Amino acid sequence: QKVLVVCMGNICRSPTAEAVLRAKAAQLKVDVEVDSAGTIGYHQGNPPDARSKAAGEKRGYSFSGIKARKIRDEDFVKFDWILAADQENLAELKARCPQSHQHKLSLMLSHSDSEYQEIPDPYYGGERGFELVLDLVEDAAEQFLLKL
Amino acid sequence: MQKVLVVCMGNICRSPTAEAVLRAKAAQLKVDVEVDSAGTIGYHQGNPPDARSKAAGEKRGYSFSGIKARKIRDEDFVKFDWILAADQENLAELKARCPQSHQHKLSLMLSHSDSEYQEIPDPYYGGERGFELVLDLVEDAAEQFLLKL
């Protein structure tokens, strides 16, 4: 089984989700491959945001092997789950994904019993927003991996 | 006499509208300015303006011919006298890439209008009202930016 998390730039939200899912999958002994991508390629080839990386490493998560990339047509066929950070991400995915694979698309937090439906973009904000992404992702990752 | 560059994120909705409106206003006001637009990202590179933006603007007699999306370049910070950003995130993005010596050129487009608005909201994921709003704010801000000289 393979899971792809998608945000806009693939530098803050989806890399954090991928790091947490990877670490929790290993702890929970769930054999799943995880990856992430963005809807845009502005950050193509970049490591995760240094604040995102620092904040995650604070909780023990490794961001090794994560570099920003744009989503490919081949992603919709390759992955079994494609999880969007927010509704704009999901709209982009819905537009690009073949009809046959539309069933694979969902908001990441649709798999979390949380007052949040979307993961807010921490990029232009302070430290609170980076801690928020982690809080949301840890909970969603725990509940989602349980469902798998 | 002056060169103005308007910048939004994708250069398909907001800054193309600002460009079309500023060009028309400049002509009627006989103020000798050259206008251009660009985006902070190149996702839409080479694309004409959003078909909804184009439709809405033509509703009011504006044309979008000759406008194709393009990413902001290091060269733009030297060339232009006025660089106007659609919203705060665009401006912050510009301030990060702009050289120290040209930071004086960067501002929000609506900060030149007596408007109660400071940012031009992105209409891309919204309905018709967002497109009419972009035009309303762009027309007000364009008129006041050109008058105020």
Using DSSP's 3-state secondary structure scheme, residue B14 falls into helix
How many Å lie between the alpha carbon of B39 and the closest alpha carbon of chain A?
11
Across the interface, do B125 and A88 touch by the CB < 8 Å criterion? yes
The count of other CB atoms within 10 Å of the CB of residue A38 is 26
Beta bridge partner(s), residue A81:
A3
Asked whether A93 and A70 are in contact (CB, 8 A), the reply is no
Shortest CA distance to B10 belongs to which of B37, B33, B44, B57?
B44
Residues A147, A34: Cα–Cα separation, whole Å:
16
Residue with tokens 């990877």: A22
Shortest CA distance to B7 belongs to which of B23, B19, B20, B24?
B19
Asked whether A61 and A23 are in contact (CB, 8 A), the reply is yes
**List of chain B residues whose C-beta atoms are within 8 Å of the C-beta of residue A37:** none
Which among B36, B50, B122, B140 is annotated as catalytic? B122
Do β-strands A33-38 and A81-84 pair in parallel, antiparallel, or remain unpaired? unpaired
Helix axes A13-27, A50-57, angle to 10 degrees: 20
From residue B32, alpha-carbon distances to A6, A114, A125 in Å are: 46, 56, 39
The gap between the terminal CA atoms of chain A, to the nearest Å, is 9
Residues B98, A128: Cα–Cα separation, whole Å:
28
Resolution of this PDB entry, in A?
1.5
Residue numbers of B between 90 and 129 with CB closer than 8 Å to A:
92, 125
Shortest CA distance to A85 belongs to which of A3, A18, A33, A14?
A14
Which among B8, B23, B36, B76 is annotated as catalytic? B8
Please give the structure tokens belonging to residue B110: 């609506």
Q: Is B97 a catalytic residue?
A: no
Using DSSP's 3-state secondary structure scheme, residue B17 falls into helix
User: Residue B136: CB partners within 8 Å, gap ≥ 6?
Assistant: none
Asked whether A15 and A94 are in contact (CB, 8 A), the reply is no
The gap between the terminal CA atoms of chain B, to the nearest Å, is 11
Residues A27, B18: Cα–Cα separation, whole Å:
53
Residues A47, A67: Cα–Cα separation, whole Å:
5
φ, ψ of residue A116 to 5 degrees: the values are: -95, 135
Q: Is B74 a catalytic residue?
A: no
Asked whether A49 and A5 are in contact (CB, 8 A), the reply is no
DSSP string, chain A: -EEEEEESSSSSHHHHHHHHHHHHHHHTT---EEEEEESS-TTTTPPPPHHHHHHHHTTT---TT----B--TTHHHH-SEEEESSHHHHHHHHHHS-GGGGGGEEEGGGGS-SS-SSPPP-TTS-HHHHHHHHHHHHHHHHHHHHH-
Asked whether A42 and B43 are in contact (CB, 8 A), the reply is yes
φ, ψ of residue A81 to 5 degrees: the values are: -125, 135
H/E stretch holding B106? strand B106-108
From residue B76, alpha-carbon distances to B35, B46, B65 in Å are: 12, 17, 22
Please give the structure tokens belonging to residue B55: 């439709």
Experimentally determined by = X-ray
Mind listing the domains of chain B with CATH numbers? 1-149 (3.40.50.2300)
DSSP string, B54-98: HHHHHTTT---TT----B--TTHHHH-SEEEESSHHHHHHHHHHS
Asked whether A123 and A49 are in contact (CB, 8 A), the reply is yes
φ, ψ of residue A107 to 5 degrees: the values are: -70, 135
Please give the structure tokens belonging to residue B102: 């040209």
Using DSSP's 3-state secondary structure scheme, residue B48 falls into coil
Residue with tokens 């030149």: B112
Shortest CA distance to B84 belongs to which of B31, B122, B141?
B141
Amino acid occupying residue A111: H
**List of chain A residues whose C-beta atoms are within 8 Å of the C-beta of residue B42:** 42
| Mutation for B interface: A42, A118, A121, most B CBs within 10 A | A42
The count of other CB atoms within 10 Å of the CB of residue B80 is 22
φ, ψ of residue B42 to 5 degrees: the values are: -105, 20
| Mutation for A interface: B11, B43, B90, B95, most A CBs within 10 A | B43
**How many A×B Cβ pairs under 8 Å?**
13
B110: number of CA atoms within 13 Å, CB side?
A: 21
Which residue is closest to A90 within chain B, CA to CA?
Answer: B125
User: Residue B35: CB partners within 8 Å, gap ≥ 6?
Assistant: B3, B4, B5, B6, B19, B22, B23, B26
The count of other CB atoms within 10 Å of the CB of residue B95 is 11
Question: After which residues does chain A become discontinuous at a C–N distance over 2.5 Å?
Answer: none
How many Å lie between the alpha carbon of A69 and the closest alpha carbon of chain B?
13
Shortest CA distance to B141 belongs to which of B1, B5, B25?
B25
Q: Is B98 a catalytic residue?
A: no
